[PDB]
Each structure stands twice: as structure tokens, then as C-alpha cells.
Amino acid sequence: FPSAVTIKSWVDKMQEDLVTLAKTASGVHQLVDIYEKYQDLYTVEPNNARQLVEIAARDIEKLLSNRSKALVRLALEAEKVQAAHQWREDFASVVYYNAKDQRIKPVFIDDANFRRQVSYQHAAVHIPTDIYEGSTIVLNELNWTSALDDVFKKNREEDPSLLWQVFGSATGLARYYPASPWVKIDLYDVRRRPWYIQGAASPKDMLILVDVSGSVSGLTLKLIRTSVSEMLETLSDDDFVNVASFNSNAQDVSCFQHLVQANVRNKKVLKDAVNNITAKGITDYKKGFSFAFEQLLNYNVSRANCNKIIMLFTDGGEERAQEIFAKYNKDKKVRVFTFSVGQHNYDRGPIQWMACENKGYYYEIPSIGAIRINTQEYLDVLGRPMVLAGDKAKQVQWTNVYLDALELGLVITGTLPVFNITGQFENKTNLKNQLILGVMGVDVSLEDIKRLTPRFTLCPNGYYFAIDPNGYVLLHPNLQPKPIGVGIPTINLRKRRPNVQNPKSQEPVTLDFLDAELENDIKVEIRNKMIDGESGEKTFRTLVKSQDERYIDKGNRTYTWTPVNGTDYSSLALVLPTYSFYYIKAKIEETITQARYSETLKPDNFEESGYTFLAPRDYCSDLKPSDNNTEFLLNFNEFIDRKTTDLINRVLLDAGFTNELVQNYWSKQKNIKGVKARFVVTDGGITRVYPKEAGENWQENPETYEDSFYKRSLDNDNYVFTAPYFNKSGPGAYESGIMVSKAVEIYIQGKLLKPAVVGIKIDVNSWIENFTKTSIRMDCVILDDGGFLLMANHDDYTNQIGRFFGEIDPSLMRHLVNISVYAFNKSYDYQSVCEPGAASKQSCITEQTQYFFDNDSKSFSGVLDCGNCSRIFHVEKLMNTNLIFIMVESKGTCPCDTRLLIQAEQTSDGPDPCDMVKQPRYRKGPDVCFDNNVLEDYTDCX
Ligand SMILES: *[C@@H]1O[C@H](CO)[C@@H](O[C@@H]2O[C@H](CO)[C@@H](O[C@@H]3O[C@H](CO)[C@@H](O)[C@H](O)[C@H]3NC(C)=O)[C@H](O)[C@H]2NC(C)=O)[C@H](O)[C@H]1NC(C)=O
Ligand SMILES: *[C@@H]1O[C@H](CO)[C@@H](O[C@@H]2O[C@H](CO)[C@@H](O[C@@H]3O[C@H](CO)[C@@H](O)[C@H](O)[C@@H]3O)[C@H](O)[C@H]2NC(C)=O)[C@H](O)[C@H]1NC(C)=O
Numbered sequence: 028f029p030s031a032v033t034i035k036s037w038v039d040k041m042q043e044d045l046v047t048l049a050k051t052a053s054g055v056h057q058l059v060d061i062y063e064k065y066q067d068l069y070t071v072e073p074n075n076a077r078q079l080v081e082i083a084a085r086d087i088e089k090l091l092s093n094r095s096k097a098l099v100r101l102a103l104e105a106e107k108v109q110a111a112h113q114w115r116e117d118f119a120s121v122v123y124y125n126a127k128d129q130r131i132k133p134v135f136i137d138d139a140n141f142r143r144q145v146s147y148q149h150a151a152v153h154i155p156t157d158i159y160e161g162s163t164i165v166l167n168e169l170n171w172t173s174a175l176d177d178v179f180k181k182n183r184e185e186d187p188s189l190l191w192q193v194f195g196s197a198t199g200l201a202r203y204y205p206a207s208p209w210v211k212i213d214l215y216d217v218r219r220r221p222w223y224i225q226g227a228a229s230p231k232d233m234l235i236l237v238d239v240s241g242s243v244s245g246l247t248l249k250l251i252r253t254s255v256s257e258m259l260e261t262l263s264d265d266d267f268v269n270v271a272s273f274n275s276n277a278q279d280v281s282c283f284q285h286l287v288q289a290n291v292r293n294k295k296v297l298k299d300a301v302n303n304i305t306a307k308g309i310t311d312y313k314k315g316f317s318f319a320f321e322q323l324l325n326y327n328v329s330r331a332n333c334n335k336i337i338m339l340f341t342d343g344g345e346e347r348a349q350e351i352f353a354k355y356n357k358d359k360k361v362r363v364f365t366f367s368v369g370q371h372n373y374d375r376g377p378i379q380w381m382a383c384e385n386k387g388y389y390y391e392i393p394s395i396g397a398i399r400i401n402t403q404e405y406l407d408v409l410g411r412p413m414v415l416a417g418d419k420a421k422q423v424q425w426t427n428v429y430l431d432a433l434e435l436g437l438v439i440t441g442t443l444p445v446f447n448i449t450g451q452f453e454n455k456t457n458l459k460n461q462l463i464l465g466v467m468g469v470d471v472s473l474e475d476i477k478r479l480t481p482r483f484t485l486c487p488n489g490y491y492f493a494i495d496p497n498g499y500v501l502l503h504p505n506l507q508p509k510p511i512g513v514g515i516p517t518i519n520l521r522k523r524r525p526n527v528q529n530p531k532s533q534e535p536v537t538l539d540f541l542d543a544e545l546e547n548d549i550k551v552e553i554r555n556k557m558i559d560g561e562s563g564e565k566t567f568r569t570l571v572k573s574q575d576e577r578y579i580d581k582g583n584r585t586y587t588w589t590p591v592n593g594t595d596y597s598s599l600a601l602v603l604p605t606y607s608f609y610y611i612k613a614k615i616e617e618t619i620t621q622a623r624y625s626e627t628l629k630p631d632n633f634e635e636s637g638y639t640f641l642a643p644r645d646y647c648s649d650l651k652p653s654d655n656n657t658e659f660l661l662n663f664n665e666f667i668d669r670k671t672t673d674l675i676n677r678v679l680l681d682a683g684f685t686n687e688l689v690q691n692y693w694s695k696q697k698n699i700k701g702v703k704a705r706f707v708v709t710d711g712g713i714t715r716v717y718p719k720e721a722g723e724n725w726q727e728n729p730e731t732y733e734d735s736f737y738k739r740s741l742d743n744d745n746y747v748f749t750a751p752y753f754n755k756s757g758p759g760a761y762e763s764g765i766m767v768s769k770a771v772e773i774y775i776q777g778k779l780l781k782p783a784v785v786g787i788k789i790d791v792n793s794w795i796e797n798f799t800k801t802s803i804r805m806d807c808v809i810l811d812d813g814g815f816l817l818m819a820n821h822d823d824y825t826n827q828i829g830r831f832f833g834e835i836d837p838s839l840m841r842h843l844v845n846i847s848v849y850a851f852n853k854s855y856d857y858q859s860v861c862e863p864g865a866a867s868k869q870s871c872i873t874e875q876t877q878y879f880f881d882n883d884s885k886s887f888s889g890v891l892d893c894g895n896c897s898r899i900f901h902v903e904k905l906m907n908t909n910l911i912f913i914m915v916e917s918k919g920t921c922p923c924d925t926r927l928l929i930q931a932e933q934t935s936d937g938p939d940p941c942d943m944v945k946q947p948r949y950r951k952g953p954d955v956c957f958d959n960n961v962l963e964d965y966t967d968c969x
């Protein structure tokens with residue numbers, strides 16, 4: 028039973044230790060004087076936030092205008108060549124490429140924009156392996172499409188760095204220049220690609236009715252459970268659905284009861300509802316359709332207000348529901364596509380009738396295999412209103428982000444339909460002009476937009492970002508490839524085969540603005556203002572998740588936004604802290620001075636300067652080191668010695684200042700008693716570790732803007748203690764020790780600049796030795812921001828260093844959150860890969876529970892009562908630093924091993940989507956839309 032004055036005097040002894048050891052060993056107060064002394068070699072220039080945003084909006088506008096324009100050239104030529112064709116029937120005269128293996132076998136160049144072998148002299152062709160022998164529908168369309176060869180080749184010379192041009196086509200071919208070898212079974216139908224089903228129709232309020240009566244059971248039900256799952260893959264993220272069965276009565280076997288958004292997530296609820304359909308009852312078709320036309324009302328919701336589709340997966344029946352379409356379809360504004368599946372011997376008579384009265388189109392499905400071809404030809408009917416406005420339907424329609432099939436990265440496509448002009452201005456009988464040919468696509472990699480958005484003048488905390496009218500993400504730096512979505516991934520191994528590659532999931536990567544950052548009632552008000560807003564900034568105190576999900580910091584974010592002045596399929600946001608409005612412009616003028624700076628950077632001097640490491644960056648002719656930063660550093664010296672424009676000027680100025688911490692403050696100390704290894708990480712990407720012997724175990728990412736502790740120490744105005752991983756793979760441990768950090772504030776003529784982070788990596792053993800000799804002059808735990816053990820007595824805990832305290836003594840920690848200090852948050856990360864459960868690596872949703880300090884008052888006294896043992900806590904925060912000191916009495920007396928508070932990530936389901944739809948997230952759909960011309964002429968279907 029200790030006493031509070033004696034404890035607080037003893038905490039203030041450990042406070043004055045770790046602070047004074049930090050100020051002496053790190054050259055923090057010495058390095059400011061280095062930055063103060065050289066008042067020259069600067070002109071500190073502002074960022075201005077705004078002026079950055081309007082300039083970077085004009086380049087993202089011109090990039091989508093430069094490539095977009097090319098689309099018009101491919102659409103104008105493709106149609107021109109299509110008029111003069113004359114339909115050859117025999118083919119004894121053609122020579123294309125067939126990229127899956129007369130034909131061509133050309134030369135290949137290893138090229139680096141494509142990261143792959145390209146040709147530049149031919150287009151390649153992908154004919155899906157369901158189709159082909161020479162069948163003169165395919166073979167004739169290789170004829171006129173060969174003309175687009177000159178115009179594909181034209182646009183590389185007009186503007187380089189174009190990625191894949193592509194003409195998709197309604198018969199399934201793809202010509203794409205540059206020609207390249209296509210990447211056991213290759214499924215890949217181009218007509219079901221999100222970039223085709225997007226610019227091939229207008230958005231869609233679908234409603235799927237599924238006959239679940241007693242007559243569908245058997246084969247013809249199993250084809251409906253497959254075909255709805257193959258139907259819903261043809262929906263973009265502007266399209267809405269619902270799935271409704273009918274039988275005796277009617278019901279929306281989905282758990283939604285109205286129309287939903289057809290996200291990645293909301294389509295998964297439907298694929299578990301459809302796969303648990305039972306089959307029993309009596310068909311009636313009158314309680315069914317009258318439930319279908321009510322759902323396509325409900326204006327209450329927030330539908331898209333466009334092509335209304337009722338799709339029908341019945342088997343058969345003798346019921347023309349004539350009393351219903353006269354009730355609801357007098358104005359003929361609901362297209363009804365009807366499918367009739369399986370090999371039932373029923374009456375297909377009425378089902379053909381329902382679709383040819385209601386501008387529909389009857390389809391038929393014999394078996395599995397016809398499912399992929401039939402449920403995509405339903406978009407040729409929806410293109411019928413678009414072709415009748417061919418002067419003004421050629422807008423450009425950009426697709427929201429998805430992974431390329433050729434292995435390029437995240438790419439965004441621009442699409443434009445190509446329509447059949449073969450009589451026009453002469454007009455003509457005009458027989459089948461009411462169908463499109465295909466869609467021209469032009470890719471942009473998001474790296475090419477990131478080339479436009481420089482992330483190296485703003486503090487590593489600052490970053491650009493961009494939101495598309497459905498409230499999803501182009502440039503938030505928390506995206507990364509790998510698909511996202513859905514929940515706990517159950518795979519049984521008791522069902523698979525020694526066979527097929529388990530297909531590649533054409534799903535797009537749609538991250539929500541509320542699920543990249545932390546959800547807050549201000550950032551909602553930002554997004555709903557940013558999604559259509561004209562201009563606005565807001566400065567506020569938020570929770571900022573740290574880059575590795577250990578920690579939560581609290582800082583001031585001043586961010587602003589503006590729309591793209593051209594297209595409206597994006598709007599940008601430059602994000603800046605309050606201490607990053609001013610940056611350092613390098614300005615070096617003597618040419619001897621920067622020559623001496625280059626001397627320092629050579630690897631010959633690591634005994635004198637130490638282990639210097641130089642972050643991978645951009646210039647003319649270099650690469651990305653695969654951990655061989657030594658190879659990058661030698662290549663970088665070859666850049667200087669050939670030189671004997673601002674990144675090259677900054678790093679040379681940065682090395683010259685981090686030199687004078689070594690040769691003037693660390694060379695005069697020479698292996699201090701304590702510490703373990705001094706380190707300096709700056710922006711400019713020069714991280715130096717002084718001794719170089721155990722500094723080879725510096726296991727951190729040398730790119731400083733991706734670096735996990737550099738960003739944290741800029742926010743806090745004091746010492747930050749990081750706690751290392753436990754086991755981690757390897758020796759970061761006792762062998763490594765724990766770290767200290769403090770950013771470096773600079774006082775130029777009334778301004779605030781924080782360029783550098785200076786740190787110490789504390790020896791674990793020597794700081795044990797003070798900690799126990801101070802106690803002779805009881806169960807003590809040093810515990811940081813986040814519940815991680817830094818050190819402790821009792822020596823069963825020192826085998827744990829860095830493990831979260833909830834897996835040590837949870838009864839303290841479940842208590843300690845319940846009395847404030849420390850609170851938490853729980854966010855979701857949609858892209859974390861984990862292992863599949865029970866019934867190798869794939870994507871899943873993980874929870875992330877991150878603990879952090881709440882109030883002030885660094886004195887928390889209180890008593891814990893579990894039962895029949897009680898014990899007394901004295902929780903004391905150390906001042907001017909990031910630490911809690913806890914005095915807990917006697918593990919010893921009887922335990923309470925109830926459970927564990929567990930950090931790290933746990934595989935979980937998402938939020939409840941049945942409740943998430945109720946009050947959904949504000950959004951705005953496009954404005955065009957095309958439906959119901961007077962002409963049309965519906966006399967096909969059949
Ligand atoms: C915990 O262990 C540390 C060793 O890793 C000890 O740190 C050293 O303590 C010395 C005295 O406490 C300091 O000496 C002082 O150094 C300054 C500048 O170097 C001189 O101006 C002072 O004259 C000198 N003191 C005297 C009496 O001459 C060491 O600088 C210091 N090491 C560092 C890196 O700061 C801690 O003392 C030890 N904790 C306790 C409570 O003993
Ligand atoms: C599609 O393929 C056909 C052939 O499979 C191409 O037709 C060919 O077109 C060229 C020029 O239009 C013809 O050349 C002509 O030759 C005659 C003599 O034979 C000459 O008098 C003309 O001055 C002209 O040079 C060629 O004969 C013709 N081939 C056939 C079999 O008729 C057509 O060009 C292809 N389409 C595209 C867009 O490339």
C-alpha cells in the first residue's frame with residue numbers, strides 16, 4: 028500500500044530520466060540551431076492550399092480531356108469504315124493476331140509503361156473460347172475493324188503514354204493496341220466487362236421476379252439460382268435492384284422490402300437469399316406482377332429514375348396476365364424481359380406474349396453455358412432508346428476504378444458507344460439500325476493521375492484525394508490493389524477438385540469515403556458538400572488513424588476542395604495540417620557546397636556518417652530498389668557524377684544538415700553509456716543511423732512518406748514511444764529496443780516548420796537497470812498510448828515487450844476503459860487478406876480496435892474489485908511524453924481469468940446491410956438518361 032505523494036515524486040524521477048536522455052542524445056535542440064544558423068540556403072515558400080487545388084484540378088481535367096478526345100476519333104472512324112463494307116460471305120482471300128497463343132507472330136519490345144511485352148505495330152484480338160471457327164459473323168468483323176489500325180497507331184504519335192485502347196464489340200471481340208500476349212481456362216467475355224455494361228446503356232431500376240412454385244423444382248430451379256447470380260454481375264454501381272419471389276402469395280426474399288443500391292456488398296445479400304430458395308406452391312401471376320409494379324413505385328426511397336425493368340424467371344404457365352398490364356402499363360413504361368429456363372415441356376406461349384406487348388424481349392435458357400450468353404444480350408434492348416439520339420448520346424462515360432485484366436494496376440476507363448450508320452442522310456428502309464456496334468474504351472492508370480498530384484511539398488500527413496458522384500474514391504492513399512468486400516470467406520476443401528483456377532471476379536474496387544477514413548459527423552458534412560458542392564474548406568479537430576493501425580492521434584486538418592471544372596465525375600481535396608502551409612525550397616548557389624554535400628552521401632563513409640539510406644523517388648533514368656537501397660544509392664551517385672530539379676536540390680541540402688548532427692554532435696560523444704542507436708529521419712528521404720553495427724537491423728521502410736512513425740511524431744508536441752511487434756518474424760526485440768521520437772520545430776522569421784524527426788532507440792536492458800534501482804531508493808507496468816507493454820518488473824512480462832496489455836491482465840484493462848483513459852474506436856478495413864474458415868489467402872473484412880487517451884488530469888486513482896480478492900490501482904500519466912504508469916497490486920492473490928481484450932485484427936462480417944440500407948448514404952446519380960422514343964419499333968423479341 029504505497030502513498031500518492033511518494034509515487035508521484037517517483038514518477039517525476041522517471042520523467043526526468045527519459046526526457047533528459049532524449050534531449051542529450053538526440054540533437055533536437057542542437058539541430059534547430061543548425062537550421063537557425065543557415066538562414067540562407069532557403070526561401071520558405073507557401074503552399075496556399077487553394078492555388079494547389081485549382082492547378083491540380085486543371086491537369087486532372089486536361090488528362091481526362093486529352094484522352095477523351097481520342098475516343099471521338101475512334102468513334103468517328105469506326106463508323107465511317109463501317110458504312111463501306113458490303114458483307115463478304117466467302118473468305119478465300121483476314122490476317123489478324125489472335126492473342127491467345129492466317130496469323131501473325133511479330134517482334135516484342137520489353138516496355139515499361141505497360142510493364143510488359145508490347146508490339147506497337149498490330150492490334151491483338153481476343154475471341155472468347157466459347158465462340159469461333161471462322162463463323163462469318165466473327166470473321167467478317169475482323170475485316171472492317173482492321174481499319175482502326177491506322178487510328179490506334181495515330182494516337183500514340185499524337186500523345187504518348189496512352190494505355191490500352193480497345194474496341195469491344197457486340198459479337199465479343201476485342202481489338203486492343205498495343206498488341207500483347209494475353210494472360211487454365213480464360214473466361215473473359217468482353218461484353219460483360221464493367222467498362223462495357225456502363226457505356227452501353229443508361230442506369231437501371233431492375234426488379235427480378237423468380238417463380239418459386241412447385242413446378243420449378245428439379246433442374247429448372249438450379250438454373251435460376253445460377254442465373255440470378257450471373258444476372259446481378261451485370262450491374263454497375265448506379266443501377267438498383269431487388270429480388271422478389273412469387274408463388275401462392277408474394278415476398279421479397281432478400282431482407283430488404285424495397286429497392287437497394289447494388290453495391291458490391293448489397294449484391295451479396297441477394298446471392299445468399301437466392302441460393303436458399305425453396306420450391307413449393309401454386310403459380311398465379313396476378314399476385315406476382317401486382318407486387319412487381321408496386322416496388323417500381325415507392326418514390327419514397329431514392330431510386331435512379333430511369334429504365335424500369337421487370338425480369339421474369341418462370342418455367343411456364345397458361346396465364347396471360349391481361350388484367351394487370353392494363354392496370355399499370357397503360358403508358359408502356361415498364362420493359363418486361365421474360366426468361367424460360369430448363370427443359371420443361373410446358374407452354375412457352377404466354378411467356379412470349381408478356382414480353383412482346385411490353386417492349387420486352389423473350390429469351391430462353393436450355394442449360395448451364397447458355398447462361399453467360401443470354402444474360403448479357405439483355406443490354407442490346409436497352410440500347411434501343413440511345414441509338415435514336417445519336418447526335419447527343421455520345422457523351423463520355425467514365426468507369427469508377429477496377430483492376431485491369433492485363434495486369435496494369437488500378438485503371439479507370441473512358442467509354443463511348445459506336446453506333447451503326449449505314450443509311451443515314453440518304454435515309455433508307457433503315458432495317459436494323461437500332462443496335463450498337465460496341466464500345467471504345469481508353470484506360471487511365473491511377474498512377475498517371477498521381478503523377479499529376481505531387482505529394483512531396485506537403486507534410487507527410489498531407490495528401491490529395493478525389494471523390495466520384497456516387498461517393499467513391501479515386502486517389503485516397505489508403506486504396507491499394509487487391510479486391511475489397513463481402514464477409515468471412517467460407518471455403519470447404521471437401522468439395523473442390525484437383526482442377527479449375529476458381530475464377531478471377533470482375534468485381535470493381537469501390538472504396539467508400541466513409542470507409543477509407545474514420546467516420547465522423549463533420550466528414551459526412553464534408554462529403555455531402557463535396558459530392559456536388561462548388562467550393563469549401565473546414566478546419567476541425569479529428570481522429571487521425573496512424574499508418575499501421577496501432578494508434579490514434581488527434582490533430583488539426585484544414586482541408587479544402589473544388590470540383591473538376593470540366594467533367595463532373597470527380598471532385599478533389601487537398602488535405603493539409605496547420606503546420607504544413609510553409610515548406611523548404613532548396614536553393615544552392617556555390618557548387619562547391621553541394622559538391623561536398625555529395626561526398627557525404629557515398630557509401631565509403633558509413634564509419635564516419637553512418638548507415639545512410641535514400642528513399643525511392645522520381646527522376647529521369649532510375650528504378651525502384653527491391654530492398655537493395657545500396658543499389659539505388661550507388662545509382663544515385665552515378666546521377667550526381669554525370670551532373671558534375673528540386674528533389675535533387677533538396678536531398679543534397681538535407682544531407683548537408685544531417686551531416687552536421689553527426690560530425691559535430693555525435694562524433695563528439697562516441698558510444699554513450701545508454702541509448703542503443705541514434706537515428707535521424709527527415710523529409711527528402713535521408714534516414715541516418717549512427718553506429719551502423721546494430722543499425723543494420725533498422726527494419727523500417729526507407730520511404731519517409733510511407734513511414735509509420737514519422738507521421739505520428741509530427742502531430743504530437745512531445746516524446747512518442749513506439750512499442751515494437753512481438754515475434755514479428757524475427758529479432759526486433761531485446762536485440763532492437765524501443766524508440767523515442769520528437770519532431771523539430773523551426774523558427775524562421777515568424778512561421779512554423781517541422782521538417783525533421785530525430786530519434787533514439789532505447790536499449791532495453793539499461794532502462795531496466797534504472798527502473799529497479801530507483802525502487803530500492805508492487806507490480807509496476809510502463810504502458811503507452813495504446814495498451815502496449817513497454818517495460819515492467821516481475822520479469823514474466825519482459826518476455827512480452829510490445830504485446831497489448833489486454834492479453835496480459837484483462838481485468839485491469841476492461842476496467843480501465845470503463846473509467847475513462849483510455850477510450851477507443853472500432854473501424855473496418857475492407858481490404859485485409861485473411862485465411863478462409865470452415866464449412867490459400869483471400870480478402871475479408873477485419874475489425875480494427877485502436878485505443879487512445881481521452882482527457883487531461885494525469886492522476887487516476889481507483890480500486891478494482893473482481894470478487895473475494897480486491898486490489899488497488901494507481902494510474903499515473905507521465906508528463907511531456909506519451910506514457911501511462913500503472914501500479915497494480917499483487918498478481919499473487921486469487922485470479923480472475925475471464926477473457927481477453929484483443930487488439931490486432933479479427934476477421935468479421937460487415938455492418939448489418941439490412942439496417943445499413945434503411946437510411947442510406949446521400950449520393951447523386953448522373954443527369955442524362957435515355958428511355959422511350961416514339962419510334963423504336965418493337966417487332967423482334969421472339
Ligand atoms: C539512467 O541511465 C542513464 C544511462 O543510460 C543515466 O544517464 C546519464 O546520467 C548522468 C548523470 O545522471 C548524466 O551526466 C551528466 O551529463 C551532462 C551532459 O552530458 C553533464 O553536463 C553533467 O555534468 C553530467 N552530470 C554530472 C553529475 O556530472 C549523463 O548525461 C546521462 N546520460 C544521458 C545520455 O543523458 C541516468 O542518469 C540514469 N538514471 C538515473 C536516475 O541515474
Ligand atoms: C476487308 O477485306 C477485303 C478483302 O477480304 C478488303 O477488300 C479489298 O480492298 C482493296 C481496296 O479496297 C481491293 O484492292 C483493289 O484491287 C483491284 C484489283 O483487284 C484494283 O482494281 C483496285 O484499284 C483496288 O486496289 C481488294 O481487291 C479487295 N479484296 C477483295 C477480295 O475484294 C477490304 O479492304 C477489307 N476492309 C478493310 C477496311 O481493310
Ligand SMILES: *[C@@H]1O[C@H](CO)[C@@H](O[C@@H]2O[C@H](CO)[C@@H](O[C@@H]3O[C@H](CO)[C@@H](O)[C@H](O)[C@@H]3O)[C@H](O)[C@H]2NC(C)=O)[C@H](O)[C@H]1NC(C)=O
Pocket residue numbers: 113114447448449457458459460464
Ligand atoms: C448494321 O446494320 C445493317 C442494317 O442496315 C446490317 O446490315 C445487314 O446485316 C445482315 C447481317 O445478318 C445482312 O444479312 C445477310 O444478307 C446476305 C445477303 O448478302 C444474306 O446472304 C445473309 O444470309 C444475311 O441475310 C444484310 O444484308 C445487311 N444489310 C445490307 C443492306 O447489307 C449490318 O450488319 C449492321 N452492322 C453490323 C456490324 O452488324
Ligand SMILES: *[C@@H]1O[C@H](CO)[C@@H](O[C@@H]2O[C@H](CO)[C@@H](O)[C@H](O)[C@H]2NC(C)=O)[C@H](O)[C@H]1NC(C)=O
Pocket residue numbers: 327
Ligand atoms: C412512403 O410510403 C408509405 C406507405 O407505406 C406512406 O405511408 C402512408 O402515408 C399516407 C399519407 O398520405 C397515410 O395516409 C398512410 O396511412 C400511410 N401508410 C401507412 C401504412 O401508414 C408514406 O407517406 C410514404 N412517404 C414517406 C415519406 O414515407
Ligand SMILES: *[C@@H]1O[C@H](CO)[C@@H](O[C@@H]2O[C@H](CO)[C@@H](O)[C@H](O)[C@H]2NC(C)=O)[C@H](O)[C@H]1NC(C)=O
Pocket residue numbers: 592
Ligand atoms: C470553372 O473555373 C473557373 C475559374 O477557373 C470559374 O470561373 C469563376 O467564375 C465566377 C463567377 O461565375 C467568378 O466569381 C470567379 O472569379 C471565377 N473564377 C476565377 C478563377 O476567376 C468557373 O465558375 C468554373 N465553372 C463553373 C461552372 O463554376
Ligand SMILES: *[C@@H]1O[C@H](CO)[C@@H](O[C@@H]2O[C@H](CO)[C@@H](O)[C@H](O)[C@H]2NC(C)=O)[C@H](O)[C@H]1NC(C)=O
Pocket residue numbers: 654655656657658
Ligand atoms: C542488395 O544489393 C547489393 C549490391 O550492391 C548487395 O551487396 C552485395 O551482396 C553480395 C551478396 O550478399 C556480396 O557478396 C557483395 O560483397 C555485396 N557488395 C557488392 C559491392 O557487391 C546486397 O547484399 C543486396 N541485398 C540483398 C538483400 O540482396
Ligand SMILES: *[C@@H]1O[C@H](CO)[C@@H](O[C@@H]2O[C@H](CO)[C@@H](O)[C@H](O)[C@H]2NC(C)=O)[C@H](O)[C@H]1NC(C)=O
Pocket residue numbers: 850851852853
Ligand atoms: C470514436 O471515438 C470518439 C472519441 O472522441 C468518440 O466520440 C465521443 O463519443 C462519446 C460516446 O459516444 C461521446 O460522449 C463524446 O462526446 C464523443 N466525442 C466527440 C468529440 O464526438 C466516437 O463516438 C467514437 N466512434 C466510434 C464509432 O466508436
Ligand SMILES: *[C@@H]1O[C@H](CO)[C@@H](O)[C@H](O)[C@H]1NC(C)=O
Pocket residue numbers: 086089090093185186187
Ligand atoms: C495534352 O495533349 C498534348 C498533345 O500531344 C500533349 O502534348 C500534352 O502534353 C497533353 N497534356 C498533358 C498535361 O499531358
Ligand SMILES: *[C@@H]1O[C@H](CO)[C@@H](O)[C@H](O)[C@H]1NC(C)=O
Pocket residue numbers: 299300302303
Ligand atoms: C437460408 O440460407 C441463408 C444463408 O446461409 C441463411 O442465413 C438462412 O438461415 C437460411 N434459411 C433457412 C430456413 O435455412
Ligand SMILES: *[C@@H]1O[C@H](CO)[C@@H](O)[C@H](O)[C@H]1NC(C)=O
Pocket residue numbers: 568581582583605
Ligand atoms: C489546433 O490548433 C490550435 C491553435 O493553434 C492548437 O491550440 C491545438 O492544440 C490544435 N489541435 C490539436 C488537436 O493539437
Ligand SMILES: *[C@@H]1O[C@H](CO)[C@@H](O)[C@H](O)[C@H]1NC(C)=O
Pocket residue numbers: 753754
Ligand atoms: C508468438 O508469441 C507467442 C507468445 O504469446 C507464442 O506463444 C507464439 O508461439 C509466437 N509465435 C511464433 C511464430 O514465434
Ligand SMILES: *[C@@H]1O[C@H](CO)[C@@H](O)[C@H](O)[C@H]1NC(C)=O
Pocket residue numbers: 845846
Ligand atoms: C462502464 O460504463 C458503462 C457505460 O457508461 C456504465 O453503464 C457502467 O456502469 C460502467 N461500469 C462501472 C463499473 O461503473
Ligand SMILES: *[C@@H]1O[C@H](CO)[C@@H](O)[C@H](O)[C@H]1NC(C)=O
Pocket residue numbers: 846847848881882883884887
Ligand atoms: C477524464 O476522466 C477522469 C477519470 O477519473 C476524470 O477525473 C476527469 O475529470 C475527466 N475529464 C473530463 C474533462 O471530464
Ligand SMILES: *[C@@H]1O[C@H](CO)[C@@H](O)[C@H](O)[C@H]1NC(C)=O
Pocket residue numbers: 894895896921
Ligand atoms: C470466495 O468466497 C466464496 C464465498 O463467499 C467462496 O465460496 C469462494 O471459494 C472464494 N473464492 C476465492 C477465489 O477466494
Ligand SMILES: [Ca+2]
Pocket residue numbers: 240242243310342343344
Ligand atoms: Ca408453374
